[PDB]
């Protein structure tokens, strides 16, 4: 006899009262198995009695972890108390169908009045629950908020994440998309720089004749206003821009004096100064990224950061794809990633590969191993200078 | 699709009441045909594959309204022979297949409960309430309605039982906890009106377990204090008020709710020469709370809401009224 049965699923667990139980001798009959298949026949066996959804993702996390370990949870006990008629199994019992034999044992412990059958052994309740799972979503639909699917994805991801402690030693996506940003916006600064260089030297080409450093070019065309409004060391600007008193500002003044470029319009200068503000904000952003990503590189992989240098070594991280890919790749694959140059490249390939597996499979890494490896490379440079 | 045949069952069982109504002068033949027709179409609509709780409610309203019309008309005809039993029973069966098809509707459930309660079937009502609670164990509203019905009947032990199972379950919201405190203090008031409960330590105890509840907030304790402050005409009301005050002062000391309860604390059972004296005392509390280092915007919003209730009550003096108006305008 089975009277109720459990069903512990990702949206929640639910108990069924059974009416017109299975043909247990005839569990091996084909028409019985297709009758297990069809909803119009299996619902003439199962009817729904009580349902319990999870309240929060952490609550379901507690649920799956206790269940996987075997131990029941307190609110499962609440539910079973809440539905099962009270007794102790002296003159009558109530029979339950459950998956885990361990769970069955603990439920029999918590209640004497019930007899819990594990699906591992009692083949008819095994087939019964199997029918339950096979008509799963069509049984909860009248009160299933959403469907099983997205919630299922969430439960699985949460489980294996907490089990393997993933995020506390995963940061490589942060690193690599940092590197990608650096490369792209560096290219962007360069193209914006040459554009504003051309487009303002159209008005005043003596500036591009006199100054390099297109970033400083952007700063000075910001500060410049017009070619008409000139003075050397006006306020707070040229002193920390460049040499102020006797090297650059007077030269800029005489350049604007002898200048012959076209007289610029107001809306045009507004446009080009908008551009210059843009690109200098972007350059400040680049230096922010430089400082930050160097710090994160110390935070995750210090050893490679000190033996090759953070930007280029990070490039190697990304061009591998991951730290895990990086460590699994052998050193010749890292080479793919005279004769003295070939030998030293092979040597540093060995050393960056071993330092890679070090800094990766370290849980919270160190620094001294990369330090002494850098010293090995330096004394190898000395050994190759010996000759 | 067997829908015609299932309808054949239900309509054929409907038949002999209609036979009797034909045989009485209560309705004529064309009306009878109208009735049968409408019933058949509704029953087919119910046993359609894709059906919905609104359709169910539609049908049961139709039948119940028929019952009322039949009653009124046989009253006008001064006929006492007809009963309502068969109509009520078929009405029940509608509710039963409704909950089998859609168990997951609080709306249809409460319609069922209200139907049973208006026709006088309390044993059945408890059974229905049982199944509904089993299907939706997070619903404070059903928990409340069950327990409040039990308390109104007087079965305090089963009221407590429903409420404790519900507070064992619904631990996200404080709502059931406030409701259980409400009805428990209402039971204490019932005992006092009839004049352990001599102590009446139970709202203190539920406050103690509230302290470790998941929703355990300062605003939670504030609404707790509010429903406690309701019906202060008690014995240990000052005891429990002192207790809730000192607990939230010990736990959330400088919370603006703690300052709010520090203001509104001595106003337990007051309406009246004791009225303005305690008013001035709580006003001293108010000025102290305003000058104290608290989130003055939060505290002032609390105070102007409480003042909104204060000005909502009538029968006060104008000088007091205007100085409240000024102290509100100064916020």
């Amino acid at each position: 006899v089975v009277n109720f049965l459990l069903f512990e699923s990702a949206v929640g667990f639910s108990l069924f009262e059974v009416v017109h139980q299975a043909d247990t001798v005839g569990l091996e009959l084909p028409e019985v198995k297709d009758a297990m298949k069809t909803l119009d026949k299996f619902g003439k066996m199962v009817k729904l009695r009580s349902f319990n959804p999870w309240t929060s993702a952490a609550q379901g996390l507690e649920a799956i972890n206790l269940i996987s370990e075997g131990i029941m949870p307190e609110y499962l006990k609440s539910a079973l108390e809440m539905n099962l008629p009270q007794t102790s199994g002296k003159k009558s019992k109530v029979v339950l169908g459950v998956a885990d034999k361990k769970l069955a044992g603990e439920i029999t412990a918590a209640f004497p009045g019930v007899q819990c059958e594990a699906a591992d052994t009692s083949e008819v309740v095994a087939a019964l629950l199997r029918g339950i799972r096979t008509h799963a979503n069509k049984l909860h639909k009248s009160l299933q908020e959403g469907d099983i699917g997205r919630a299922q994805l969430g439960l699985g991801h949460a489980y294996s994440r907490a089990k393997v402690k993933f995020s506390v030693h995963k940061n490589d996506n942060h690193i690599i998309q940092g590197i990608a940003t650096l490369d792209a916006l560096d290219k962007s600064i360069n193209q914006g720089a040459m554009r504003v260089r051309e487009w303002y030297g159209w008005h005043f080409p003596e500036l591009i004749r006199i100054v390099s450093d297109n970033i400083t070019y952007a700063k000075v065309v910001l500060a410049i206003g017009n070619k008409s409004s000139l003075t050397d060391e006006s306020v707070d600007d040229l002193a920390n821009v460049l040499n102020q008193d006797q090297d650059k500002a007077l030269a800029i003044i005489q350049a604007a004096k002898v200048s012959m470029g076209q007289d610029i319009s107001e809306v045009d200068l507004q446009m080009v100064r908008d551009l210059a503000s843009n690109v200098t904000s972007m350059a400040d952003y680049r230096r922010i990224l430089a400082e930050s990503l160097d710090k994160k590189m110390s935070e995750v992989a210090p050893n490679l950061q000190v033996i090759l240098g953070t930007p280029v070594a990070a490039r190697l991280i990304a061009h591998a794809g991951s730290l895990t890919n990086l460590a699994k790749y052998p050193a010749s694959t890292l080479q793919i990633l005279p004769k003295v140059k070939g030998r030293i490249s092979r040597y540093l390939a060995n050393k960056c590969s071993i330092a890679s597996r070090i800094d990766n499979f370290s849980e919270k890494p160190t620094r001294h191993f990369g330090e002494v490896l850098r010293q090995q490379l330096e004394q190898r440079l000395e050994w190759y200078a010996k000759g | 699709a067997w829908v015609a045949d299932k309808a054949r069952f239900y309509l054929e069982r409907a038949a002999p009441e209609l036979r009797e109504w034909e045989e009485k002068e209560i309705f004529t033949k064309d009306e009878i045909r109208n009735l049968v027709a409408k019933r058949s179409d509704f029953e087919h609509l119910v046993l359609a594959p894709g059906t919905k709780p609104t359709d169910f409610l539609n049908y049961v309203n139709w039948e119940r309204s028929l019952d009322r019309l039949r009653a009124k008309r046989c009253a006008r005809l001064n006929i006492r022979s007809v009963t309502s039993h068969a109509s009520q029973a078929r009405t029940f069966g509608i509710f039963e297949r409704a909950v089998l098809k859609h168990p997951g509707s609080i709306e249809l459930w409460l319609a069922y409960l209200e139907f049973a309660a208006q026709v006088k079937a309390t044993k059945r009502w408890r059974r229905i309430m049982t199944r509904a609670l089993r299907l939706h164990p997070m619903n404070a509203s059903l928990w409340t309605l069950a327990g409040r019905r039990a308390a109104q009947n007087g079965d305090m032990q089963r009221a407590r039982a429903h409420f404790l199972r519900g507070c064992r379950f619904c631990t996200r919201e404080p709502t059931l906890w406030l409701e259980y405190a409400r009805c428990e203090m209402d039971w204490l008031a019932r005992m006092e009106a009839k004049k352990p409960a001599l102590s009446g330590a139970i709202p203190i105890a539920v406050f103690d377990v509230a302290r470790k509840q998941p929703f355990w907030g300062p605003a939670a304790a504030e609404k707790f204090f509010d429903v406690f402050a309701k019906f202060g005409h008690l014995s240990c009301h000052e005891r429990i008020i002192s207790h809730v005050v000192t607990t939230m002062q010990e736990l959330f000391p400088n919370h603006p709710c703690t300052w709010s309860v520090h203001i509104r604390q001595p106003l337990v059972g007051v309406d009246t020469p004791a009225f303005p004296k305690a008013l001035r005392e709580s006003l001293a509390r108010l000025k102290a709370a305003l000058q104290s280092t608290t989130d003055r915007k939060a505290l002032a919003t609390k105070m102007v809401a409480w003042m909104d209730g204060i000005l909502a009550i009538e029968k006060l003096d104008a000088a007091i009224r205007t100085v409240l108006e000024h102290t509100k305008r100064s916020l």
Binding site: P85 | P196, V209
Partner: peptide, 28 residues
């Protein structure tokens, strides 16, 4: 008869709240 929910005994008291209020009802 699982028709009804039974008034809770100490044997049927699951949570600390129930134990507290049952202690109160016992000393009552």
């Amino acid at each position: 008869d699982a028709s009804e929910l039974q008034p809770i005994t100490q044997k049927t008291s699951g949570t600390e709240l129930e134990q507290t209020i049952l202690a109160i009802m016992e000393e009552s």
